[PDB]
Amino acid sequence: TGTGLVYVFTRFFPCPARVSTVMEMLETEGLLGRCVQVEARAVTEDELLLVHTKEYVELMKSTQNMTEEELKTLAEKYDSVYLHPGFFSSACLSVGSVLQLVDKVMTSQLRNGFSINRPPGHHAQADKMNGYCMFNNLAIAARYAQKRHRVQRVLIVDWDVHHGQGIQYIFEEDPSVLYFSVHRYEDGSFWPHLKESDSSSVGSGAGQGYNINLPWNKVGMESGDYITAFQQLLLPVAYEFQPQLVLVAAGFDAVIGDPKGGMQVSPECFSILTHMLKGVAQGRLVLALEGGYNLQSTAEGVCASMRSLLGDPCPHLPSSGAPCESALKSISKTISDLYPFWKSLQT
Ligand SMILES: CC(/C=C/C(=O)NO)=C\[C@@H](C)C(=O)c1ccc(N(C)C)cc1
Ligand SMILES: [K+]
Ligand SMILES: [K+]
Ligand SMILES: [Zn+2]
């Protein structure tokens, strides 16, 4: 019957202010005091080895004992990555903050939780850094829920404006972890420019049907488009999947005002989206911060999400409840690509 909040994240360009402005607005709007302040912890190597290779962990650990030239040389071998001697330490705390909430949520000590962590996670891969992530916070937390808390089925929902290809790759053959991502795509012209971000990538082998990509091919999508996408695609699959834990890649670079997302989703929308997800998995729901590059837009998105976690009434949506035709095409094609796998889509 509480909502947990973890904040250790600053001591690490598109900014430590990302996370300190969130806390400030959480405090100002009275939401911080209404949360159960949960302490972060450092991830162990064994928890990291759930998802990442041994050679990658060793390489990432040696990142602190490197010179400024050693860091820049390594960083260029990755796509969109900046290294600094404190990255590894902060990334270990970033993972561990999610693991702290998963513990509290699975043991019924709290109803739900939100980690306000940096660095983000959803681009990080088995053996490489990518898009500012070193370790995949949510991928680790999902396998940790299975191993330590005996979860059979984890649902990961990724509403950051970018595709979390790292989460997709890690669980691509895995029917026990269902990954849903809605993201700006524009037929590959938007980063990370991947064919496998399209709705045709539905998983492979026994994982088929358990990877769901919803790619936006126009800019300026709004709350009605996300609500329609949740109500007609994600939630029917979720109730059929019957997860025992929901993890959210909670980026807010789709919020109105984000300098690089190019979407017009009102922050209030994330109250609704969060509320919908509470109906699944007996409300066992953990959000973890990903992207967000307008300090104020990001802080409002967090606050709207936190209000639903706390059980406050849903807000008024300023935007139309109607989805645009471009969104309906994207939604239609993903449903079609996943039709043979989910009875609930076959209306
Ligand atoms: C990775 C990312 C967002 C991730 C996110 O938010 N995932 O959720 C944005 C990239 C495209 C970007 O904008 C960028 C800017 C500068 C740069 N260098 C100066 C090297 C490299 C990349
Ligand atoms: K996404
Ligand atoms: K999967
Ligand atoms: Zn993003």
Rounded CA separation 215/46 (Å): 34
- How many C-beta neighbours within 10 Å does residue 185 have? 23
Q: Is 128 in the pocket of ligand 1 (CB under 6 A)?
A: no
CA of 207 to the centre of ligand 4 (A): 25
Burial class from Cβ neighbours inside 10 Å (0-12, 13-18, 19+) for residue 33 reads exposed
What is the pairing mode between strands 211-216 and 36-38?
Answer: unpaired
CA 329 distance to own-chain centroid: 24
Q: After which residues is the chain broken (C to N over 2.5 A)?
A: 8, 12, 14
Rounded CA separation 173/187 (Å): 24
191 phi/psi in degrees, rounded to 5: -60, 140
Give the angle 167-297-114 at the CA atoms, nearest 5°: 50
Annotation-wise, does 52 bind a ligand?
Answer: no
Of all atoms in ligand 1, which is nearest to the CA of residue 260? 13
Rounded CA separation 66/61 (Å): 10
Contact assessment for residue 149 and residue 108, using Cβ atoms and an 8 Å cutoff: no
Give the angle 294-295-298 at the CA atoms, nearest 5°: 80
84 a catalytic residue = no
Rounded CA separation 239/246 (Å): 12
Q: Which ligand is nearest to the CA of 13?
A: 1
Indicate the SS3 state at residue 111: coil
H-helix or E-strand containing 215? strand 211-216
Q: Which of 206, 178, 204, 130 is nearest to 280 (CA)?
A: 178
Rounded CA separation 249/253 (Å): 12
Q: Write down the catalytic residue from 52, 84, 122, 123.
A: 123
Helices (H), 215-324: 223-229, 235-241, 269-277, 295-309
Structure tokens at 32: 């911080």
Q: Is 260 in the pocket of ligand 1 (CB under 6 A)?
A: yes
Annotation-wise, does 253 bind a ligand?
Answer: yes
Structure tokens at 167: 């989460």
Structure tokens at 131: 């898009």
Give the angle 314-258-251 at the CA atoms, nearest 5°: 60
- Residue pointed to by tokens 């358990």: 210
Amino acid identity, residue 335? I
Q: Is 132 in the pocket of ligand 1 (CB under 6 A)?
A: yes
Rounded CA separation 216/263 (Å): 10
Q: Is 158 in the pocket of ligand 1 (CB under 6 A)?
A: no
Contact assessment for residue 278 and residue 270, using Cβ atoms and an 8 Å cutoff: no
H-helix or E-strand containing 138? helix 137-149
Give the bridge partners for 265, in sequence order. Answer: 255
Contact assessment for residue 182 and residue 226, using Cβ atoms and an 8 Å cutoff: yes
339 phi/psi in degrees, rounded to 5: -55, -50
Q: What DSSP line would sit under 279-305, residue for residue?
A: TSGGG-EEEEE----SHHHHHHHHHHH
CA of 203 to the centre of ligand 3 (A): 6
Q: What DSSP line would sit under 66-101, residue for residue?
A: --HHHHHHHHHTSSS----TTHHHHHHHHHHHHHHH
Annotation-wise, does 162 bind a ligand?
Answer: yes
For residue 132, is it left (φ>0), alpha (ψ between -120 and 50) or beta? left
Rounded CA separation 262/267 (Å): 14
Rounded CA separation 50/106 (Å): 19
| The 154-158 sheet, strands edge to edge | 36-38, 3-6, 112-115, 285-289, 245-250, 154-158, 177-184, 211-216
Structure tokens at 124: 């990080």
Rounded CA separation 287/323 (Å): 25
Indicate the SS3 state at residue 178: strand
CA distances from 138 to 29, 85, 94, 101, 135 (A): 28, 23, 10, 12, 9
Structure tokens at 296: 């104020």
What is the pairing mode between strands 211-216 and 3-6?
Answer: unpaired
Q: Which of 191, 199, 180, 190 is nearest to 219 (CA)?
A: 190
CA of 252 to the centre of ligand 2 (A): 10
Structure tokens at 247: 């993890």
Rounded CA separation 203/207 (Å): 5
Contact assessment for residue 75 and residue 81, using Cβ atoms and an 8 Å cutoff: yes
Contact assessment for residue 79 and residue 57, using Cβ atoms and an 8 Å cutoff: no
Contact assessment for residue 27 and residue 116, using Cβ atoms and an 8 Å cutoff: no
Q: Which residues surround ligand 4, an ion (CB under 5 A)?
A: 160, 162, 251, 253, 291
Rounded CA separation 173/236 (Å): 22
CA of 191 to the centre of ligand 1 (A): 8
Q: Is 162 in the pocket of ligand 1 (CB under 6 A)?
A: yes
Rounded CA separation 38/29 (Å): 19
Rounded CA separation 335/216 (Å): 14
Contacts of 233 (CB under 8 A, 6+ apart): 212, 214, 331, 334, 335, 345
- How many C-beta neighbours within 10 Å does residue 73 have? 12
Quoted resolution (Å)? 2.3
Q: Is 342 in the pocket of ligand 1 (CB under 6 A)?
A: no
The method recorded for this entry reads: X-ray
CA of 240 to the centre of ligand 4 (A): 28
Give the angle 214-145-129 at the CA atoms, nearest 5°: 60
